[PDB]
Amino acid sequence: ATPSLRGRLARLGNPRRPILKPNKPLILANHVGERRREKGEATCITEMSVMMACWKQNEFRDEACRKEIQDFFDCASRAEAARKMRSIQENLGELGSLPPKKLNKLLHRFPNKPHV
Amino acid sequence: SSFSIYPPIPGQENSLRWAGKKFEEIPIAHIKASYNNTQIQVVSAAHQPLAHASCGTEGFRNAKKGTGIAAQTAGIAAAAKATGKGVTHVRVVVKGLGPGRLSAIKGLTMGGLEVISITDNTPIPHXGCRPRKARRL
């Protein structure tokens, strides 16, 4: 449930001292904020480290590191595939919640009335 | 297959023995993951130390030792020294919050050591020493 907004803000007819001092007025806007892009992180680290172990153990020659080298290539392709497809599908995937453009139109049909 | 997250209470008698020994008999792996270093120590059920390893002792130096990879290598090294003394399962206790928590956990997994229980014992003062001031970077 929503926290009570009774006797919180600084008002003339308020005996209780202020509890909340908002930066901007608590008025619902007719639009929601855009989704925030997820910050990236380095990929293929658990596979690069094991690759470096074989290189240091065999004088930097891939004559015996073939198993590790291929997985590093596989991880690079796997990370490449996911990175070059996340942006397009996430816009309309919606995770069950309408994209920001649809919510803005929905809110405009039923706007908030501060005046009158 | 009813599996309970909570540990088997010592007071009761739970028929869950790993490698022929009880829950409390299994050694402990302490992980102190600070913001600049990761220290791993394995101790016996009687709190007798078996092996010790950290990002500093593995060749990593200065800023490098605070990264995740350094903690991952320390986990591999600590497990190898522990496995040499003949330990299969260990109850890992994580101390503090840092960038090396995840790497050290899987470092023991890939080093030839098996974990069964995870505990977080971060120092949480209940009101305690006054910490240092803020950094106006």
Binding site: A42, I45, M48, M51, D62, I69, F72, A79 | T67, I69
Partner: protein
């Protein structure tokens, strides 16, 4: 670009058209290629349907070209393949019974195998953070690795060769050296691995 967005890259392989009845999905692909009435670009002058060509040779031939002398670049690539063939033929003659069926006399097999050993596995890209540049390793893509191997071959045989020794013979020597994993190009490939392994803790800086 005089070609509009509708034009596409032509298909040159003759075998792709002569045996289409053995597959169904591929049949739908090219039957709609003209049913959509999509325009086709003119055939490039370099690529041809001759069975004696090879895509890796054409790219290597183009890079050797300086200015606009395609004839000279093709002439140099012809002699280099001949020079490699002559050396391997001579070595085959002066060999024992077990050594005879070891030497490869196919320059195309040697050329393809040589470049696959000069390709670095992990590269470096500078990243600026905190007012300083840190060399951060990255998983270079296959096209970049293939291109980087060719550039190293050309760079080495153009700079540190003697003035008397001709280009076709100097490049032939390095191809055999790279075929045995002992050429200076292989040394340069390992040197890039040395720097990448040294900065293995800086991989966290990159954000992709």
């Amino acid at each position: 670009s005089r070609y509009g967005p509708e034009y596409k890259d032509p298909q040159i392989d003759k075998e792709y058209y002569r045996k289409p009845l053995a597959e169904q999905t591929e049949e739908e692909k090219y039957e709609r290629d003209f049913k959509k009435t999509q325009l086709i670009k003119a055939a490039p002058a370099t690529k041809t349907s001759s069975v004696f060509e090879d895509p890796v040779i054409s790219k290597f031939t183009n890079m050797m070209m300086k200015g606009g002398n395609k004839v000279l670049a093709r002439s140099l690539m012809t002699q280099t393949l001949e020079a490699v063939k002559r050396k391997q033929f001579a070595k085959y003659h002066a060999a024992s019974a077990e050594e005879q069926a070891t030497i490869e006399r196919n320059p195309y097999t040697i050329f393809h195998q040589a470049l696959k050993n000069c390709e670095p596995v992990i590269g470096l890209v500078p990243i600026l953070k905190g007012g300083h540049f840190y060399q951060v390793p990255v998983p270079l893509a296959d096209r970049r690795r293939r291109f980087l191997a060719m550039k190293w071959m050309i760079a080495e045989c153009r700079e540190k060769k003697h003035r008397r020794v001709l280009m076709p013979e100097k490049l032939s020597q390095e191809l055999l050296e790279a075929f045995h994993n002992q050429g200076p190009v292989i040394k340069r490939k390992h040197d890039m691995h040395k720097m990448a392994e040294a900065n293995r803790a800086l991989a966290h800086y990159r954000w992709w």
